[PDB]
């Protein structure tokens, strides 16, 4: 079915350095744009950056235009995150979730992966 | 009123050559640059649509490239078969302005 | 960027009840506030795409509502099974801030 | 100050099939979005090139909005870059695309209980399309009706009792275009 | 197969006026723009215009914008120029030429129209 | 069962309002098209174009997109037709045919008795 | 605009052997299921009634001796058995495209 898994969590040292994946399976891959956002425990999410597969033009969230920069692997329908320059304040979950196979609307996000907790 | 200035317009060449023919605009088309072939008999059709080589349904030889304002269209392998005036036109603004034309011809 | 506000980030009513959780906005999104849901342990699900349409799956307890900036989710008749965290989202303009967060526990 | 018509080619009577698609031109009229905007109806609003938030504040020379009804599964391949048959046979948007794909779901007008064979699609062609090209050469494709040859058209059958994936989605596919001279329709 | 089917060489006395003609036919004419050209001997193709044969309004050029005029005719699949105000200098292959989409280049041409301004 | 008349034959001067009705009755009118046809002095049958009764809205024919326009009372149980502008050449028997259900009609199941137009001062 | 072209367009039948009447099409309105055109009769002062639709299948309640054939541009409708009430124009129909057309309409005759 529509299955978004991720790599488990991640434990970092600041001033450092990962490239968390996020594997799509069960859909046509190139139609969707793969969206990711964060989440900090027990607070609100805010977005990261979206990822357009066939083309590779992504956008981002101001906060995020330094840190983090989205790629695409169209051979194993897989979106990658790579994050540079960490510090203690940007670990949390990430998510990469696809929208509703049947809304279209741009924001709506129908379709989660697990969840990468990264520290 | 962007003017194409096809700087050269006469090519010498042979068969079996790879020959490369160059367009210079004033601004920056931002990439909407064609590149057509006028037979002598009049038959001009497009050989690439957008300029990184997007070429429609011509062989698979002519493959241009380029970048900014000055692009350049290319022939790899040559034959007395492309022998033509080969335009370059610009798609940005209004009203279009085609190229010269490099006449190829054998030495 | 809009950003959205949420009633109380702590909500405890009783079990059977009704809650009634309203989501302010800063600037006019037309229609397009969404709803999710997410209990502890687990990535949300999305409840209510535009403003009332809810998602082919989800029990009908939740009715959503609301025009111009405040908007309001509300459930039927609660269970044990929907007490959960309840996040705002907007998608009009694309910094699509979700709300702060509200969670329910029963008193 | 003419506010132009979104009129008679969004809420029209009947949408043209996938294979001929239908286009208008509109221009020299001030083009009111707000009754696109403010709707729960669409299903997808999907604006490239461009953001949503902006397109009453901009100006074009021309629009080209290409009604046509094709199958709610088959949604997605309106969009730059996809493969298909809606995308392939039927229906090819270019890659450099701005404009704002819009198709909601009308199930109570495209279908009838015993079926709708009334919408129909290209299946069967040699190459596929070229961006904005449309055919209506209903010649029998090879690849007198019989074996290795059979028509190129398909119809759609439409009974209420589908499911989602197998209902009329009329989709409608505004095209801006962005050329540098006299900015016809504005906001 | 697609073809812009074009008149044949025509000549004409300095004062008089000329309509040539380009009757597309194999395409949906009525959907895309009609753009006429004129290359004189011994130098590049000129733009002189445009027509939509859809609902008929141009795109005209600044040189020729008083002698030329374009008009289509929707049930027979063609499309019109009406050189007016003669003279020797309007001896040229004119050419007509369209295509589906307009950013992507000029897809079909007609073969050539020679007018020829003599006594 | 399935029964339609429309109104009395009608003479008409060119150029002048003309509303030939068609009241339907024996079958629920919300899931059926009525559409319109068109015979002129022993002429072949042309389709005028028609209405669609849950949506409110019609298809006409390109070259009738001028002169005719279509009305629905729903409650009444009637679609109307409209002739206005209309030239010397158009003056015909006006079936008011029946369809199927919107936008899925092929065949013209059951029509109506005729109303035989004449334009004349 | 697809238009129908009937011949012969005035038919001469004896009262028992066979007829056959064709309406043919500028294109080919056929899909690999359904044929589209469908047939009608029109007696004087009478309003047609579907004789035959999708070119093969009957409707229900007609005197059952139309049969007709057809697939792509041509079609054929046929009437075995003839006697009085078989004195009409056979019309012609496609349901291809939104501007629907009738054919011109061959009138059937007895001896
Ligand atoms: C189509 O017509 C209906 C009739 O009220 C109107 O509500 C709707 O807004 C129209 N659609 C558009 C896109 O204007």
Redesign the interface.
């Known amino acids: 079915e529509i299955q978004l898994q991720q790599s488990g969590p991640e434990l970092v040292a600041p001033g450092a350095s990962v490239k968390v994946s996020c594997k799509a399976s069960g859909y046509?891959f190139?139609?969707?744009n793969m969206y990711w956002?964060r989440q900090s425990h027990?607070?609100?999410?805010?977005?990261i950056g979206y990822i357009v597969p066939?083309?590779g033009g992504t956008?981002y969230?101001?906060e995020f235009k330094g840190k983090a920069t989205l790629t695409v692997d169209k051979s194993s329908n897989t979106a990658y995150i790579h994050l540079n320059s960490l510090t203690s304040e940007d670990s949390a979950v990430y998510?990469c979730?696809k929208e509703?196979?049947?809304?279209?609307?741009?924001?709506?996000?129908?379709d989660?992966?697990?969840?990468t907790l990264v520290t | 009123d962007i003017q194409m200035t096809q700087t050269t317009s006469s090519l010498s060449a042979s068969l079996g050559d790879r020959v490369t023919i160059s367009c210079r605009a004033s601004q920056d088309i931002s990439n909407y640059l064609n590149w057509y072939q006028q037979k002598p008999d009049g038959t001009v059709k497009l050989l690439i649509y957008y300029t990184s080589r997007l070429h429609s349904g011509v062989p698979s030889r002519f493959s241009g490239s380029g970048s900014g304002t000055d692009y350049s269209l290319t022939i790899s392998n040559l034959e007395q078969e492309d022998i033509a005036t080969y335009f370059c036109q610009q798609g940005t603004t209004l009203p279009y302005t085609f190229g010269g034309g490099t006449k190829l011809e054998i030495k | 960027?809009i950003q959205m506000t949420q009633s109380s980030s702590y909500l405890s009513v009783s079990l059977g009840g009704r809650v009634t959780i309203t989501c302010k906005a800063s600037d006019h999104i037309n229609n397009?506030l969404?709803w999710y849901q997410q209990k502890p342990g687990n990535?949300?699900?999305?409840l209510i795409?535009?403003v009332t349409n809810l998602?082919t799956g989800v029990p009908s307890r939740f009715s959503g509502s609301g025009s111009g900036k405040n908007f309001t989710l509300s459930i039927a008749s609660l269970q044990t099974e929907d007490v959960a965290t309840y996040?705002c989202?907007?998608?009009?303009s694309?910094?699509?801030?979700?709300?702060?967060?509200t969670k329910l526990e029963i008193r | 100050t003419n506010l132009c018509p979104f009129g008679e080619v969004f809420n029209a009577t009947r949408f043209a099939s996938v294979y001929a698609w239908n286009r208008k031109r509109i221009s020299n009229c001030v083009a009111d979005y707000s009754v696109l905007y403010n709707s729960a109806s669409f299903?997808?609003?999907?604006?490239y090139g461009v953001s949503?938030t902006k397109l009453n504040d901009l100006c074009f020379t021309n629009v080209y909005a290409d009604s046509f009804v094709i199958r709610?599964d088959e949604?997605?391949?309106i969009?730059?870059?996809?493969?298909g048959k809606i995308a392939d046979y039927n229906y090819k948007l270019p890659?450099d695309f701005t404009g704002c794909?819009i198709?909601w779901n009308s199930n109570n007008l495209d279908s009838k209980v015993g079926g709708n064979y009334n919408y129909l699609y290209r299946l069967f062609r040699k190459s596929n399309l070229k961006p904005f090209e449309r055919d209506i050469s209903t010649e029998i494709y090879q690849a007198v009706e019989g074996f290795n040859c059979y028509f190129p058209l398909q119809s759609y059958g439409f009974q209420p009792t589908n499911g989602?994936?197998y209902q009329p989605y009329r989709v409608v596919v505004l095209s801006f275009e962005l050329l540098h001279a006299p900015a016809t329709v504005c906001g | 197969q697609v073809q812009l089917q074009q008149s044949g060489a025509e000549l004409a006395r300095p004062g008089a006026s000329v309509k040539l003609s380009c009757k597309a036919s194999g395409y949906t004419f009525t959907f895309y723009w009609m753009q006429w050209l004129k290359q004189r001997p011994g130098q590049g193709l000129e733009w002189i215009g445009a027509i939509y044969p859809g609902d008929g309004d141009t795109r005209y050029t600044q040189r020729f914008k008083d002698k030329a005029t374009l008009t289509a005719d929707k049930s027979s699949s063609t499309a019109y120029i009406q050189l007016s105000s003669l003279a020797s200098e309007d001896s040229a292959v004119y050419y007509c030429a369209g295509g589906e989409y307009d950013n992507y280049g000029f897809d079909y041409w007609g073969q050539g129209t020679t007018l020829t301004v003599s006594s | 069962e399935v029964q339609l008349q429309q109104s009395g034959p009608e003479l008409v001067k060119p150029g002048a309002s003309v509303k030939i009705s068609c009241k339907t009755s024996g079958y629920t009118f919300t899931e059926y098209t009525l559409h319109w046809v068109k015979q002129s002095h022993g002429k072949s049958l042309e389709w005028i174009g028609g209405f669609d009764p849950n949506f409110g809205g019609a298809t006409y024919n390109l070259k009738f997109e001028d002169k005719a326009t279509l009305t629905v009372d729903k409650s009444s149980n009637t679609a109307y037709m409209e002739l206005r502008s209309l030239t010397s050449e158009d003056s015909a028997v006006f079936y008011c045919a029946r369809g199927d259900y919107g936008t899925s009609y092929a065949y013209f199941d059951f029509w109506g008795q005729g109303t035989t137009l004449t334009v004349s001062s | 605009d697809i238009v129908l072209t009937q011949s012969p367009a005035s038919l001469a039948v004896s009262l028992g052997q066979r007829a056959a009447i064709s309406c043919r099409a500028s294109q080919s309105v056929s899909t690999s299921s359904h044929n589209y055109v469908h047939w009608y009769q029109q007696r004087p002062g009478q309003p047609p009634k579907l004789l035959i639709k999708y070119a093969s299948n009957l409707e229900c309640g007609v005197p059952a001796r139309f049969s007709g054939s057809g697939s792509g541009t041509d079609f054929t409708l046929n009437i075995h058995p003839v006697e009085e009430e078989d004195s009409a124009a056979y019309y012609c129909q496609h349901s291809w495209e939104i501007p629907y057309t009738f054919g011109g309409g061959t009138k059937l005759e007895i001896k």
């Open positions: 046509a190139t139609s969707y956002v027990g607070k609100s999410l805010e977005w066939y083309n956008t969230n101001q998510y979730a509703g196979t049947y809304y279209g609307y741009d924001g709506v996000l129908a989660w992966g697990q969840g | 960027d397009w969404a990535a949300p699900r999305l795409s535009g998602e996040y989202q907007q998608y009009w694309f910094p699509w801030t979700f709300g702060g967060g | 299903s997808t609003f999907k604006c949503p709610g949604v997605r391949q969009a730059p870059g996809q493969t890659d794909v198709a989602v994936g």
